[PDB]
Design a protein around this ligand. Sequence first.
Ligand SMILES: COc1ccc(CC[C@@H](OC(=O)[C@@H]2CCCCN2C(=O)[C@H](c2cc(OC)c(OC)c(OC)c2)C2CCCCC2)c2cccc(OCC(=O)O)c2)cc1OC
Length: 128
Amino acid sequence: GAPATVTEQGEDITSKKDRGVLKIVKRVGNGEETPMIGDKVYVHYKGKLSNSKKFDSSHDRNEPFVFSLGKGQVIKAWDIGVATMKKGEIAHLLIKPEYAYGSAGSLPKIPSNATLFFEIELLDFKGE
Ligand SMILES: COc1ccc(CC[C@@H](OC(=O)[C@@H]2CCCCN2C(=O)[C@H](c2cc(OC)c(OC)c(OC)c2)C2CCCCC2)c2cccc(OCC(=O)O)c2)cc1OC
């Protein structure tokens, strides 16, 4: 399924090349620009724990999910991965614990050493 496709064909977008964040572009976006650190980003997404025990559709549609890029408002994998997206792009991200909640997790929602998967659509981004 989608996570296995990212394992096998995904691009490693980590600085260390440790496969901690793997990406596939599922729908190509518009133009060439991608957001800079400090830009406000607007996304729709859905995500899950790799063991399929929790799923998040809070912003699948409904209200956009909004955060300032590269400011630690989200897990490290998102500041890395959303930054690589074009407006209108849809991407899949597969994320190891070191780029999400680590050995600590975020109990009881996120267990220790959880792998996460997301489908993310970048709607827009704007300068601070
Ligand atoms: C810099 O480090 C961190 C920053 C922020 C957090 C909190 C969780 C942080 O969650 C995340 O960064 C990732 C990626 C963005 C979407 C949410 N997300 C999650 O893991 C999801 C998540 C996690 C949550 O809490 C852990 C949520 O809050 C209850 C949550 O609410 C919608 C969603 C997971 C849910 C289970 C299935 C797997 C996904 C968060 C949650 C909700 C909104 C956020 O920013 C926008 C806003 O405030 O409107 C940020 C943890 C951080 O470190 C572990």
